[PDB]
Design a protein around this motif. Structure first.
Motif, PDB file in Angstrom:
ATOM      1  N   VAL A   1      56.970  61.232  23.475  1.00 18.96           N
ATOM      2  CA  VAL A   1      54.575  60.609  23.116  1.00 18.96           C
ATOM      3  C   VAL A   1      55.107  59.634  23.756  1.00 18.96           C
ATOM      4  N   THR A   2      56.125  59.031  24.056  1.00 20.52           N
ATOM      5  CA  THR A   2      57.023  57.155  24.321  1.00 20.52           C
ATOM      6  C   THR A   2      56.368  57.184  25.530  1.00 20.52           C
ATOM      7  N   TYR A   3      56.337  58.668  26.611  1.00 22.13           N
ATOM      8  CA  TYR A   3      56.957  58.253  28.037  1.00 22.13           C
ATOM      9  C   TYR A   3      54.806  57.763  27.867  1.00 22.13           C
ATOM     10  N   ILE A   4      53.657  59.025  27.462  1.00 22.39           N
ATOM     11  CA  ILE A   4      52.675  58.389  27.535  1.00 22.39           C
ATOM     12  C   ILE A   4      52.024  56.800  27.297  1.00 22.39           C
ATOM     13  N   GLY A   5      53.037  56.460  26.915  1.00 29.38           N
ATOM     14  CA  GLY A   5      52.286  54.680  26.331  1.00 29.38           C
ATOM     15  C   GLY A   5      52.972  54.600  27.138  1.00 29.38           C
ATOM     16  N   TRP A   6      53.503  54.636  27.872  1.00 28.22           N
ATOM     17  CA  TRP A   6      54.118  53.572  29.364  1.00 28.22           C
ATOM     18  C   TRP A   6      53.870  54.208  30.654  1.00 28.22           C
ATOM     19  N   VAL A   7      53.491  55.777  30.600  1.00 27.92           N
ATOM     20  CA  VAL A   7      52.424  55.701  31.351  1.00 27.92           C
ATOM     21  C   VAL A   7      51.365  55.237  31.864  1.00 27.92           C
TER      22      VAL A   7
ATOM     23  N   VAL B   1      41.267  63.517  30.395  1.00 28.87           N
ATOM     24  CA  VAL B   1      42.414  64.572  30.519  1.00 28.87           C
ATOM     25  C   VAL B   1      44.170  63.596  30.990  1.00 28.87           C
ATOM     26  N   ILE B   2      45.083  64.070  30.521  1.00 31.28           N
ATOM     27  CA  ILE B   2      46.389  63.508  31.129  1.00 31.28           C
ATOM     28  C   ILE B   2      47.358  64.653  31.129  1.00 31.28           C
ATOM     29  N   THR B   3      47.942  64.770  32.629  1.00 32.65           N
ATOM     30  CA  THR B   3      48.956  65.748  32.740  1.00 32.65           C
ATOM     31  C   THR B   3      49.810  65.100  33.697  1.00 32.65           C
ATOM     32  N   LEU B   4      50.815  64.906  32.678  1.00 31.19           N
ATOM     33  CA  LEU B   4      52.603  64.776  33.196  1.00 31.19           C
ATOM     34  C   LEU B   4      53.387  65.369  32.947  1.00 31.19           C
ATOM     35  N   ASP B   5      54.538  65.200  34.161  1.00 31.78           N
ATOM     36  CA  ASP B   5      55.460  65.932  34.550  1.00 31.78           C
ATOM     37  C   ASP B   5      56.728  65.439  33.680  1.00 31.78           C
ATOM     38  N   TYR B   6      57.259  66.154  33.420  1.00 33.58           N
ATOM     39  CA  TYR B   6      58.994  65.148  32.846  1.00 33.58           C
ATOM     40  C   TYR B   6      59.893  65.960  33.834  1.00 33.58           C
TER      41      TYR B   6
ATOM     42  N   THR C   1      45.483  60.495  34.965  1.00 34.34           N
ATOM     43  CA  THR C   1      44.866  60.533  34.496  1.00 34.34           C
ATOM     44  C   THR C   1      43.343  60.127  34.979  1.00 34.34           C
ATOM     45  N   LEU C   2      42.403  61.037  33.955  1.00 37.44           N
ATOM     46  CA  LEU C   2      41.048  60.620  34.503  1.00 37.44           C
ATOM     47  C   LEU C   2      40.315  60.147  33.232  1.00 37.44           C
ATOM     48  N   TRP C   3      39.631  59.448  33.896  1.00 40.04           N
ATOM     49  CA  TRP C   3      38.708  58.393  32.787  1.00 40.04           C
ATOM     50  C   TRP C   3      37.083  57.800  33.077  1.00 40.04           C
ATOM     51  N   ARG C   4      36.504  57.842  31.423  1.00 42.35           N
ATOM     52  CA  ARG C   4      35.394  58.419  31.720  1.00 42.35           C
ATOM     53  C   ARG C   4      34.185  57.045  31.210  1.00 42.35           C
ATOM     54  N   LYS C   5      33.111  56.890  31.948  1.00 39.88           N
ATOM     55  CA  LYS C   5      32.776  54.900  31.529  1.00 39.88           C
ATOM     56  C   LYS C   5      32.022  55.639  30.016  1.00 39.88           C
TER      57      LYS C   5
ATOM     58  N   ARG D   1      42.229  72.315  34.896  1.00 40.79           N
ATOM     59  CA  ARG D   1      42.749  71.303  35.218  1.00 40.79           C
ATOM     60  C   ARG D   1      45.034  71.278  35.639  1.00 40.79           C
ATOM     61  N   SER D   2      45.387  72.215  34.466  1.00 37.69           N
ATOM     62  CA  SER D   2      46.472  72.018  33.832  1.00 37.69           C
ATOM     63  C   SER D   2      47.713  72.487  34.992  1.00 37.69           C
ATOM     64  N   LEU D   3      47.311  73.042  35.672  1.00 38.72           N
ATOM     65  CA  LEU D   3      47.598  74.210  36.424  1.00 38.72           C
ATOM     66  C   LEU D   3      47.329  73.130  37.933  1.00 38.72           C
ATOM     67  N   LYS D   4      46.733  71.810  38.382  1.00 38.77           N
ATOM     68  CA  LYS D   4      47.462  71.476  39.364  1.00 38.77           C
ATOM     69  C   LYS D   4      48.869  70.538  40.263  1.00 38.77           C
ATOM     70  N   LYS D   5      48.937  71.030  41.405  1.00 41.60           N
ATOM     71  CA  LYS D   5      50.498  70.408  41.791  1.00 41.60           C
ATOM     72  C   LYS D   5      50.453  68.630  41.579  1.00 41.60           C
ATOM     73  N   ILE D   6      51.249  67.536  41.261  1.00 40.06           N
ATOM     74  CA  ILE D   6      51.067  66.053  41.024  1.00 40.06           C
ATOM     75  C   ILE D   6      52.040  65.181  42.314  1.00 40.06           C
ATOM     76  N   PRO D   7      51.499  64.775  43.230  1.00 34.97           N
ATOM     77  CA  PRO D   7      52.029  64.311  44.266  1.00 34.97           C
ATOM     78  C   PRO D   7      52.871  62.823  43.658  1.00 34.97           C
ATOM     79  N   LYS D   8      53.682  62.642  45.067  1.00 40.40           N
ATOM     80  CA  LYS D   8      54.400  61.105  44.304  1.00 40.40           C
ATOM     81  C   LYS D   8      53.722  60.102  45.047  1.00 40.40           C
ATOM     82  N   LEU D   9      53.248  59.040  44.419  1.00 35.08           N
ATOM     83  CA  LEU D   9      52.844  57.626  44.081  1.00 35.08           C
ATOM     84  C   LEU D   9      53.469  57.123  45.474  1.00 35.08           C
TER      85      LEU D   9
END
Ligand SMILES: Cc1cccc(C(=O)O)c1N
Ligand SMILES: Cc1cccc(C(=O)O)c1N
Ligand SMILES: Cc1cccc(C(=O)O)c1N
Lengths: 268, 265
Positions: free
Chosen positions: A196-202, A218-223, A263-267, A161-169
């Motif tokens: 870490v603040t950007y994680i909180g904002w996302v 899982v969380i993947t964040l591009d800066y 982000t990926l979330w599990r029940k 998962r760490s190698l995946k390209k992220i599209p623009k919303l």
């Protein structure tokens, strides 16, 4: 903490604090990201990069250079509970000749089981101009001896998962949190907004109904660009699906992109 | 950490973290306030508590902070070890006090001190109430018998009626909102966030040239997850003193009032 026997990685134990936990009485992902930063900074001190700089090397200090995150990818299997001991191991590796990678493994201190893993990409920035500056050798020599020679990856799997390209919303976003501003507690020792603040904002744009019934896996964040002390941020999220979300952080004014992620979330 | 030999106070060492420091590479006052909360929480666990006693939980009663007063002589540097000692003292039917002493773990010198007032409140009606004899008896055994004060002044600066800031304020920071990192495990806004919000209205020119020496903060009402706060500051004064007020952006309801003293670096 301490360096390992070969001196190519650093290990440290942390006892989860009362104010570090959320609704589940387990560590928040922001607490985890803060602990990854702390073990990374203690690794730098153990190899001779003193507390006069924020884990910057000796040659970086001479060039007025600081470290900046380009990407962060965190995967948590079990969040440590309040009072639990978590052991984190961290190491660095140059990525050919473009950037620098820092990886971490999180383990249950008693059983040794892997409860999480993280990887990050770093580039250098002139602290005065805030321009990304190219490494023209000499800097690499100053810390090559401190990296494992053979490749050592926290995510060694093929097509992980760490190698995946992220599209623009694309607008309109399904969910949003507008007008987010950093306060003095959000800044690091260099007076830049803490990564870490950007994680909180996302995560601010995730509905409370998902937060209460699911756990973040899982969380993947591009800066892409830094948020300045006087900037205002808008957090946008759209469901792409386990629940998966696409995220975008942009400046409230002109709409300039500062971060994109998933982000990926599990029940529960 | 651990209880002391007599079991009437609790001690704990902390190593100052990279993300816990400000521009001076020393711990922020918010980091200090978080560590005071942590050692206070660990003291409560060591004596068998939740915060709440058996009779409090039967009567739907909780402890709530009314006032906090922190004085710092030297802020610990990044990597320094700080030892904090904490204890509680009864105030009869009024409530209880929690005090702390911060020391340099190497030299033993006192680098700071803090005191806080706590009142009882019915969790449902929000009405403050006097401490009953039954409730008091359940925790007096965990307090030192002889009075022990972090601020042993007879007429201390910790205790004095803070006035309400008159409009217009000299400085302001508007539209402050808590995010998920500002909440505690019960999803209430962490008491330390209010210190951060009060300090937001201090001009950057004072922050860069001065160090915070004393902060006194009164807690009147809690900010909810969906509330918006306005931070207001006016100079009252080498030493700079400020009067502070936190109020809700909407109706202007007061949530906190306080004072700070700063000294030139
Ligand atoms: C300067 C620095 C060194 C190592 C890790 C981090 C981080 O935030 O994870 C960091 N910000
Ligand atoms: C290879 C290496 C190990 C530990 C810390 C650093 C650093 O840049 O602070 C580093 N470059
Ligand atoms: C003396 C003392 C120690 C720890 C916690 C409490 C309390 O009642 O919350 C208390 N009263």
């Amino acid at each position: 903490g301490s360096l390992t026997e070969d001196g190519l990685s650093y290990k440290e134990k942390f006892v989860v604090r009362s104010y570090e936990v959320g609704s589940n009485k387990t560590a928040t992902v922001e607490t985890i990201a803060n602990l990854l930063q702390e073990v990374g900074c203690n690794h730098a001190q153990s190899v001779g990069f003193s507390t006069d700089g924020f884990a910057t090397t000796t040659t970086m200090r001479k060039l007025h250079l600081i470290w900046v995150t380009a990407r962060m990818h965190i995967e948590i299997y079990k969040y440590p509970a309040w009072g639990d001991v978590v052991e984190i191991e961290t190491w660095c590796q140059s990525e050919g000749r473009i950037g620098t990678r820092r990886d971490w493994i999180l383990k249950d201190s008693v059983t040794g089981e892997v409860t999480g893993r993280a990887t990050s990409k770093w580039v250098m920035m002139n602290q005065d101009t805030r321009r990304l500056q190219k490494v023209s050798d000499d800097v690499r020599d100053e810390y090559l001896v401190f990296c494992p020679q053979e490749p050592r990856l926290a995510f060694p799997e093929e097509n992980n998962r760490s190698l995946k390209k992220i599209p623009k919303l694309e607008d309109p976003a399904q969910y949003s949190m507008i007008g987010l501003k950093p306060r003095r507690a959000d800044l690091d020792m260099n007076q830049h907004v803490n990564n870490v603040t950007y994680i909180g904002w996302v995560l601010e744009s995730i509905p409370q109904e998902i937060v209460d019934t699911h756990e973040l896996q899982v969380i993947t964040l591009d800066y892409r660009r830094e948020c300045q002390q006087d900037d205002v941020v808008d957090s946008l999220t759209t469901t792409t699906s386990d629940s998966q979300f696409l995220h975008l952080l942009r400046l409230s004014g002109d709409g300039q992109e500062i971060n994109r992620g998933t982000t990926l979330w599990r029940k529960k």
